[model samples]
Target chain A: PGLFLTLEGLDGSGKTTQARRLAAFLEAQGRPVLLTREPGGGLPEVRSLLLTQELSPEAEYLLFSADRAEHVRKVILPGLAAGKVVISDRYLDSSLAYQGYGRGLPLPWLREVAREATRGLKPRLTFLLDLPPEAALRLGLEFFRRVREGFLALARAEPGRFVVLDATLPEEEIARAIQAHLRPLLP
Target chain B: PGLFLTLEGLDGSGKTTQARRLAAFLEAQGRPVLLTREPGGGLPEVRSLLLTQELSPEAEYLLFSADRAEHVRKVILPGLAAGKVVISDRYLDSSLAYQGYGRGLPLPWLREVAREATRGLKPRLTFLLDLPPEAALGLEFFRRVREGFLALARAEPGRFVVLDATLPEEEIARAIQAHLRPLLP
Candidate 1:
């Protein structure tokens, strides 16, 4: 089985940038890498609905889970099965942070639905881009503050799987740290 | 709290027709009625995705549950709160039959998601138009047979009235009204 890695953080926390850099680094080593994102990972229509629609928290989470089912089955699993290092821009933790923590949906319910959605597929390693809501300069500071806390709490609970990094760090320095962590795991 | 009734059956099993008839009949009797349907009950975008997109069975069920949550919260509950007899064309049972039985998804998972989707709201009375696969003229007879069986099995002792959908529409309508009379306010 190939390594499954995920980058999780609030929007503008350098997840997209780091995911691309990591994928580029791995590909330079001649490793097969599949880079993907949630809500639209091989599911553009579902992604559109999530972005544009005004949905209840429950409905929104369910829709995200629905897209995740497609993402895992169609995209992620196939990449892993082919012995590729699969790096997702975001995965289940995003749901926990945004929907469960940010919007007050139950964490257990989200996980229950996720079990079916991703077929119990969890990332082998997750990179948590930790950033203060103020430094992130985002909306609803109180809400983002709670969401940031949610991400930290998750990282603490699963210390082995999560690598908490400062998003405010220089981009090259952050990328170097990620590459160093992943270097031993690379085949 | 007002009565919540639901009609369940195959696509062409007169669910829509009978729901309309029942609403009209209740109105003539000086009763308030609200009629609605699933998948698009209060969420049209979700409905469009369900109808048009190619989705996995799990995704399909989740999307339906999402719409059901909105339907329960925005439509059914309010109708019932206002003392109106709310009649839905299809409800959670439809998911059990089509998604669970027909598509071979697990029944328990469907019900579990439904718990949150419906907020534990069940119908006061459910009318299952028991139509055979042959008469329904549907695709995949085996799937339809299993779906029909699941629908029948769900009719626990009292909450469900299994009607013979092959009967004349007028006869079926009469049977429904007769069963519904005692429950009316």
Candidate 2:
């Protein structure tokens, strides 16, 4: 089975750091791993628009989802179809965690729109790099609050598919734990 | 409430023709009119991206909706608050009839996404410029199908105004002016 893995955390939670480490680890195992990130890639226009222009909550969220739809179609799906380990820095969960929970959009409606935008794609396994509230900025105290809670809740609800780990752990230790969990899922 | 009007039809459906005439007649009456078109106005990048890029259906539609959302906020809403008659070349109904009905995207989903994109704003009146299927090249099937969807939009004149393309242009312009004059100031 093709493995679709995603890493989720707030700013400075080492999601990006670990994503690369995990990719290298899998590559060393003779597995192909294509690493990608959200709100970027082949869509420079959307990235620029997102950064420079102000958009309504709906428009902003839809733009991100649009990028995801394209990313999934152009990158993620192709990588997985070729039996590569596809690791996205972020995915639909980040939207659910932030937009749905953080920004207070209705989860059900967000999920419904996501269902259409993503064409009902789901990752086989997701890694939740749980971080302490202090790891986030003081300005974003409330920002980390709901998002962390949301990610925890999601992981709890889907224990069989989500691997929740402490981000405060040593980088090697965190990577070690993820690799152990990931080894069983590899083809 | 200020008047919000929109025009919808195929390329040859005279929407551009009537939009200008209507705007001029209203302005000459001393009631201000702001005429605008979609995929334009503060969204030129979106226009270029749409033409040059091969995007998924979801991405392409979102780009169009994003432009419309910004247009409604930056242009349409302000003109209305300043008490001007806001007439767009085409609006949400164009998306409904063309993208939703014509291209067979789920109407309910398009309308649902539009609710957020448009903030539940509906035009006070929409004019569907009825065109003959023969008016377009090799589009007879789409014209007939869209005619039905166009009828669905014009089910009530208060919300949807169906304009017969066969009528003389000046006559239709005068008829529209008559309607606008009686609407609330």
Candidate 3:
């Protein structure tokens, strides 16, 4: 199985900064890397999500589901089978936390829809970047703070599948910690 | 609620020909008219359904659902809300009979999905044209005949306002004229 790693965090938790650094680190080690993000990941439907400023929860859910369905088929599956390190910025956890939990979709319906949409293919390694809400607020985060907590709560709930890296730590220290953890997992 | 009319029955049941007559009949009365066909008549997605020669039942369901979803947002709702006669060639019934019974989709699951997709808008006046299986197999009608039968038998049995498909040709006309009696109510 390919190493499907993903970075999860609230806005401005330095995910972009860290993801790029991680991609650089991987590229230095000569690993094939596919860097992608959701909610407009250069994908048609994802881009459509970015433009979707106003829509009902059901409408938004269906659009995002359709986008994710297309995204998995086109990008994620291809990157993995090609033996590339597919590092995505956010994935279904974001959906579960944001649309499923934060937006208050009935838990059963959310679970059913997600399971049906994903066909159970999920990230093997997930890093939940724990950024203090105040810090993200100071950093001018994208007003989806509740969604941020939704992910953190999920990470705390499922500690085995998720690794929460403290964003409060120094940059070099964070990098060292991430590298140390991921090094053995990389081929 | 506006009149949501669908034309059903085996091919060579004179549906396409009859649909035009129905359209002409409706228009002559100076009623507001909005004509569409289903499992199609909406967008490129429906075109995909027609053009897709080899499709799995699941994929076929998706294509039909896509068009229907778009059609709801694009045409049906607006027309119906404005009190127009919204005539569709096929409706969710097509899925029930065609995919549910004909293609062997788990009937309950298929109906549930169809219900989710359609959001429960059904027709007001339904004109079911009855034609023989032999007539359906005729050179002018083979393909559509097969498509029609699959869709109907799979349908959830219901008490339609009037069933017009089983009568003689002249009788079929009188029934259609009389059956629409319940249409505007």
Candidate 4:
């Protein structure tokens, strides 16, 4: 199976930058990585299933899960068989962080639905960067108020998967920290 | 969540009328009922989710799950809280029967997604009015498919609460009584 790594964190915590850095690093290591997001990519039908056309959480979950189903068949599985390293910027964990935590799907239920979607294929390795809970919003990813609490709670749920990194750390040091945790798993 | 009682079978299964009949019974028993069908329950969003657009098997699952989620929260939950009986004419089970059977969402993944939407909520009581597939489809509520065994195989997985669909109308009356036996829990 391909190595699927996801980088997640608060808005200004610089996770996206790290995701980019991580992808570039893996590319340097000669791994094929496909970075994408929900409501887009694979199966235009799934992409078209976006809830803006029709609004409902149930509807939203449907589209999100549909995208995953199609993506797994199209992207994940085949790529893994080819022995490529797939670094998803996000996956069902983002859903846990976004919809389950951010949108309030209830943790246990979110866990269950997410497990169903991923088929128990977790990040193989997950890196959740952290910052002040309130600080997460000032940076803007906490688009909704209570939703931030959801993200914070996930960070709290499994601190091991989440690295409460010092956001104030200079970019060079922070990048080094991420690499220290990630590189060992490269093989 | 309140229990969902759905009436499902072939077209002439008399769902609309029996839904009315069940609704009346529940009302007399002081329970509320939502006698409705997919794409017809007046949910413009979900109605649109249905036939208004074209969908693949995966997309179809999403639309059905969306309709179900909306129905559970918007309709079922509120009524159940007030001690009402949710006598939906057809529900997620219909999707399983129609889509799983009719459209062939046999892909285990699609089925898993569908089950997730329902949260494993089976109908509190499902009156599977087991009319012969051909005979029922000939009528308006008709859901006639090409093969009999296929329809039965398709309809079988719902794990229905009641399965008195095979008896004739008069016998069905008695059958309904018998079927309601295990419902008191």
Candidate 5:
């Protein structure tokens, strides 16, 4: 099986940029890397729903999971089957943190639906770009704290697979920090 | 609480037409009626995707489920709350018929998500527009779809009121009206 890696964090916390950088670094190391994001890339119409509509949290996350189902079926699985490295900008953890914690949806229920959505696929490695609870949102700090705590608690659940990084570090430092963890796994 | 009714059938089985007529009849009977459909009406954007897009069965059904989630929250639930007669062209059973039996997604999983989407809401009455397998589409595939519809109607005996859609329009209308008589406040 090909390697699956995902980046998780709040909005503006550098998931997209770091995903690009990580993909480039892995490809430089001669691994074929497929970098993709949720709600788009494989699903433009679904992305529009995410972009232009206000949905119930359950509906919103369900749409995202549907997009992931297509993305994994079309992009990730095939890319991995062909022995490529698949680096997704966000995946299930994003839902746990944002929808489950941030939006007050029950985590256990979300996980149950997600099991069907991703077919129990988990990344070999995940990088949690740790940021202050108040990083990018205009809401009260308390809500953001709950989201940040949610991510940290998730990372704690699978310490062996998750890396807690200080996202405030420079872009160069962040890239090097990720590469350091990924280097040992490269074969 | 308001009366909730739904119509289900294959294409040309007259679900849409019957739904419209039923809505008008309820309104004329002095009950407010909200007539709607899935994958559209409540969400035109999702309708476009259903209309022109190619999607995997899992993805397609999920989109429909998402649409239903929104539809139930914004349209159906509110309409019922206001004591209106809510008549939908299709509802959760459509997915059980078309997606689960017809397209081969797991029925158990389909029902699980549906529970969450509709918040365990089910219609008081469902009019399954019964049509022969030969009424539309190719033989073998249409046969499977018809069997699927039959299975869904059987799954919920009390809630489902299967009707022979080939009967006269006025006849079909009468059965629905008779049922509606017992439902409105």
Candidate 6:
């Protein structure tokens, strides 16, 4: 068995930095680790369209779903099957927050597509870098505000799976807190 | 009001040729017509991946769905809204037959994704170039054979006009024109 962990937050919220740190920390202890990110994890062409093109919200979500489907099948599943620690910088929650809440897409439909994209696989642990919209990047303040609320709502619904962190804290402090939560689950 | 029509069949079944003839014939009759093809109708990147990559059936279906979603919203719906006759070379039925029956994917799931992709838009007429698998190209012989059957079965009653693709090209075109004449506005 292996552990699947994800880091989620608004853009520029240190998810990338912290995901790398976490992976290095686990690797230093002689554990096998596979680090990845979504939206373009294995599909750069889809990623380019997502960032460059003007797309309908439905088409945007479907493109993301297609990328996730490939990632889940080709990367995440293989890493987990090999009994390695699979850590991703972003995952389904990003879509749920950005698309579902920020862009006002239907939550049920988002979840339905995710079920097929991921085949019902969920992270064993999720680190939500919780902060106000003023501290994030891209999108309008109001849009990020809704996305923040969406992430919190998801965390509230699944408290055990999520570790809501104060992103304003020092990076070392946040990493230590994550490591503490992960201690019990470590092999 | 607008008319939405589609051409369905195996590869090399004369769908492209007939779709062109139908559009030309309708244009000669003074009707505004829009002709398009799928898997890459509006999304060349998606179409490229579908052809080049070795994707899982689910992933492959989703890419096609994405292309269709874009095609419907950006291309098909706009043509229809302007009361133009929109004829697609292939549509949802292609996915149902090739991906559902040929690839062994779930039909219900395929239809569910299509419902959202198309927003419940069904072609007013679907012309199936019914033919034996021996004449088609690529894929397995058995797979295309089954795909033809599945395509025929989903035609329903009034919506589909099945033609013998083995017939002479002009005869097939004449048959299609005859069936389509009654439904014209």
Please identify model 5 stretches exceeding 4 Å from their true place.
A136-141, B51-53, B137-139
Q: Is the docking of candidate 2 incorrect, acceptable, medium or high quality?
A: medium
Q: Which 10 consecutive positions of candidate 6 chain B have the poorest summed lDDT?
A: B141-150
C-alpha lDDT of all candidate models, in order: 0.85, 0.77, 0.64, 0.59, 0.83, 0.85
Interface RMSD of 6: 1.1
lDDT of model 4 at residue B93? 58
- Separate DockQ for every predicted complex: 0.71, 0.56, 0.14, 0.27, 0.63, 0.61
For candidate 3, lDDT tens digit of each residue in A100-148?
6667765555555555345467887788878766776331333366677
The C-alpha TM-scores of every prediction are 0.95, 0.87, 0.65, 0.63, 0.94, 0.94
Model 6 chain A: which ten-residue window has the lowest total lDDT? A133-142
- DockQ value for model 6: 0.61
Better of 5 and 6 by lDDT: 6
Backbone clashes in model 5, listed as residue pairs: none
List residue ranges in candidate 6 displaced over 4 A. A137-139, B137-155
Name the regions of candidate 3 deviating beyond 4 angstroms: A40-46, A49-53, A132-143, A167-173, B1-149, B159-179
Candidate 5 CAPRI-style tier = medium
lDDT of 2 by residue, A38-146 (tens): 8765355777788887765566677677777788888888888998999988888888888777887778767767776777778888999898778643226787798
Candidate achieving higher lDDT, 1 or 4: 1
TM for chain B in all models? 0.92, 0.88, 0.77, 0.70, 0.94, 0.92
Off by over 4 Å in 1: A137-139, B52-54, B137-155
Chain A TM-scores of all predicted models:
0.96, 0.92, 0.86, 0.75, 0.92, 0.97
lDDT of prediction 1: 0.85
> What's the lDDT for residue A109 in model 6?
79
Native-structure RMSD, model 2: 3.0
Worst 10 residues of 1 chain B by lDDT: B141-150
> Per-residue lDDT of B39-129 in model 3, one digit per residue for the tens?
5554443453334344445445545665675576668888989988887776666665565555655555555444545566777656666
